[PDB]
Design an enzyme around this catalytic site. Structure first.
Site, mmCIF file in Angstrom:
data_model
loop_
_atom_site.group_PDB
_atom_site.id
_atom_site.type_symbol
_atom_site.label_atom_id
_atom_site.label_comp_id
_atom_site.label_asym_id
_atom_site.label_seq_id
_atom_site.Cartn_x
_atom_site.Cartn_y
_atom_site.Cartn_z
ATOM 1 N N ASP A 13 37.595 -15.646 -4.947
ATOM 2 C CA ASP A 13 37.707 -17.104 -4.955
ATOM 3 C C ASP A 13 38.191 -17.749 -3.660
ATOM 4 O OD1 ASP A 13 39.229 -19.507 -7.293
ATOM 5 O OD2 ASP A 13 37.961 -19.762 -5.507
ATOM 6 N N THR A 59 48.146 -23.401 -5.868
ATOM 7 C CA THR A 59 48.654 -23.298 -7.236
ATOM 8 C C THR A 59 50.118 -23.712 -7.157
ATOM 9 O OG1 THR A 59 47.173 -21.436 -7.728
ATOM 10 C CG2 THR A 59 49.004 -21.797 -9.235
#
Lengths: 325, 298
Positions: free
Chosen positions: A172, A189
């Site tokens: 990713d 995140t």
């Protein structure tokens, strides 16, 4: 040393593919189709097999039209250009790329292994030796990437795969970006965001190293250093830089972590005069054989366990912009 | 539980090309500042950015019984209460609790200024009231733009300093990342002769007078007064010797009028770029020149 050799040859290989992206390589009729594991909440990823060679790959289905909405259409057109230009042992691979009215199909390599997040959560936490094993792989990967002025920006158990050889494979590149200078998108995140990102001061390579500190801590503790039920509190803790280490954490580890989780950029490992060597030469990594880890010769501590039918439009649509691909 | 990534809207930091007007009285603005002191995103913003941000805050009038925010809904703004009373509610599973109230004071939804995320509680007005609101996109753009402008400006003042010419782009940016700023009012002392030399300065505005009390010139006695050795202006730097030696300051430095200097700690500088002496030698054809500049006559 060979380190310089490797990186030099590496930048060469990269700049070449970067300034001349390998567009539409293979043909869709060379690959069949098997299972279809690629739902979740976005994108359509389905397994597939090859003809002559008969290999297994993971093809991401990105409807040329599906784009345009969502959050962005460049964080992808860019994502593709990077995956194609990069080459590292602990990085997933863009095997084949192609498009046409279907348009923008990613033929990623496939490792029938396990997720890092599932493994870590099950056993709770890794022993320091085991954690050091995975860490080394990420340090090396970041040195490579930063050598090419590329920042990952989304380090986390969730984005790490354990292949059948027991080694890490990073996935990713949604936030991956080539930046020489400073960048500003607030992304990543929550648990893993750097103070500079949260506060919009501008940033570059230093955030990846901070994330590593978070990643190493969570592996050896089972939980992230700035955890909280409310996102707001997570950030306030992140900004204060204050960290409390479990009782079982060794001295060398605590020291390394105090240096990775430095809110002060003048003191953060990786960002100082020696760069990544401040990390590679740290007492916690003393029993690490960097070349061995690179050649994947070390014995990993854990070997993991191991629909529909869409069609084109018979006509190319959004190809009046997704040219570069 | 797998943690999902977050992402704010992207934006070209580098100023596009000058191309939000919401009136506010002194009392109102002053009150907005107070209400924002502790909010982390605002907490350590400079004078200017805070002003531009308050400028951008639009007013939102609310009639009693109206929902300011509803739990679950997407969030885009942060609100400061101006007038009115409000009830706060939080639904957990199937239960909704009237957890707390606001009485003409308060703020909420700070998270919305970071990225788009679901509202965690519902706020309802219980009277006619007024709230100051701030949209994420507006807030992020004001801040990034300003910090990217500041960076370019810091970059320039470092670049024009000859001592740092051998520095690479990325090395100048590491400095820009951590370097400080200080304002001095005319006449106030910046550097005191005798104390320890920990940092160096780069004048970005105003002038600085460097004085030395001529006593440390012999064997016990003399002048014991005030003598101006040098006089620096915009673009110049002083305290450079802290980068190459470790002896108390030779002379004192005072602000000649209103001054603004970039202040860099020597120890931080070394941890980031290594010792200054090596940098000076990087470009060997200018090593001598550099040496004479640092330890020379004038």
């Amino acid at each position: 040393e060979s380190v310089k050799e490797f990186l030099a040859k590496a930048k060469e290989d990269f700049l070449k593919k970067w300034e001349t992206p390998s567009q539409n390589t293979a043909q869709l009729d060379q690959f069949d189709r098997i299972k279809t594991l690629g739902t979740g909440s976005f994108g359509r990823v389905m397994l597939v097999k090859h003809k002559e060679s008969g290999n297994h790959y993971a093809m991401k289905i990105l409807d040329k039209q599906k784009v345009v909405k969502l959050k962005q259409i460049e964080h992808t057109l860019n994502e593709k250009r990077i995956l194609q230009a990069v080459n590292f042992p602990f990085l997933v691979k863009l095997e084949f790329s192609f498009k046409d009215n279907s348009n923008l199909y990613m033929v990623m390599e496939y490792v029938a292994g396990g997720e890092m997040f599932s493994h870590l959560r099950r056993i709770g936490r890794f022993s320091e030796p085991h954690a050091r094993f995975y860490a080394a792989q990420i340090v090396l990967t970041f040195e490579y990437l930063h050598s090419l002025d590329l920042i990952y920006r989304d380090l986390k158990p969730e984005n790490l795969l354990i292949d059948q050889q027991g080694y890490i494979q990073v996935t990713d590149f949604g936030f991956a970006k080539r930046v020489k200078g400073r960048t500003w998108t607030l992304c990543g995140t929550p648990e893993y965001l750097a103070p500079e990102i949260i506060l919009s001061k501008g940033y570059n390579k230093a955030v990846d190293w901070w994330a590593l500190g978070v990643l190493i801590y969570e592996m050896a503790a089972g939980y992230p250093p700035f955890f909280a039920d409310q996102p707001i509190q997570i950030y306030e803790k992140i900004v204060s830089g204050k960290v409390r280490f479990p009782s079982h954490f060794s001295s060398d580890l605590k020291d390394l972590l105090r240096n990775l989780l430095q809110v002060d950029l003048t003191k953060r490992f990786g960002n100082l005069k020696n760069g990544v060597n401040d990390i590679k030469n740290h007492k916690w990594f003393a029993t690490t054989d960097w070349i061995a880890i690179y050649q994947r010769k070390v014995e990993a501590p854990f070997i993991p366990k191991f629909e529909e039918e869409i069609r084109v439009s018979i006509n190319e649509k959004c190809g009046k912009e997704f040219t570069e691909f | 539980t797998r943690r999902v990534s977050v992402c704010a809207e992207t934006f070209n930091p580098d100023e596009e090309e000058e191309d939000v007007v919401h009136p506010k009285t002194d009392e109102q603005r002053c009150r907005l500042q107070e209400a924002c002191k502790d909010i982390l995103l605002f907490k350590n913003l400079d004078q200017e950015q805070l002003s531009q941000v308050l400028d951008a805050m639009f007013e939102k009038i609310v009639k009693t019984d109206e929902h300011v925010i509803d739990q679950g809904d997407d969030g885009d703004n942060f609100y400061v209460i101006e007038r009115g009373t409000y009830d706060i509610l939080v639904t957990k599973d199937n239960q909704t609790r009237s957890v707390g109230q606001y009485d003409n004071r308060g703020s909420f939804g700070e998270l919305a200024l970071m990225y788009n995320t679901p509202r965690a509680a519902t706020i309802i007005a219980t009277s006619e009231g007024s709230l100051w609101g701030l949209d994420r996109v507006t807030f992020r753009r004001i801040i990034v733009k300003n910090n990217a402008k500041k960076r370019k400006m810091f970059e320039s003042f470092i670049e024009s300093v000859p001592l740092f010419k051998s520095l690479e782009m990325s090395e100048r940016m590491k400095i820009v990342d951590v370097i400080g700023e200080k304002i001095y009012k005319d006449g106030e002392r910046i550097i005191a002769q005798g104390e320890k030399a920990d940092s160096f300065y780069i004048i970005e505005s105003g002038e600085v007078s460097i004085l030395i009390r001529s006593k440390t010139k012999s064997n016990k006695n003399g002048g014991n007064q005030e003598v101006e050795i040098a006089h620096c202006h915009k673009g110049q730097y002083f305290g450079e010797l802290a980068l190459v030696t470790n002896k108390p300051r030779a002379a004192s430095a005072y602000g000649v009028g209103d001054v603004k200097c970039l202040v860099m700690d020597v120890q931080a500088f070394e941890r980031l770029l290594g010792p200054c002496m090596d940098i000076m030698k990087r470009n060997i054809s200018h090593y001598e020149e550099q040496l004479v500049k640092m330890f020379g006559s004038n």
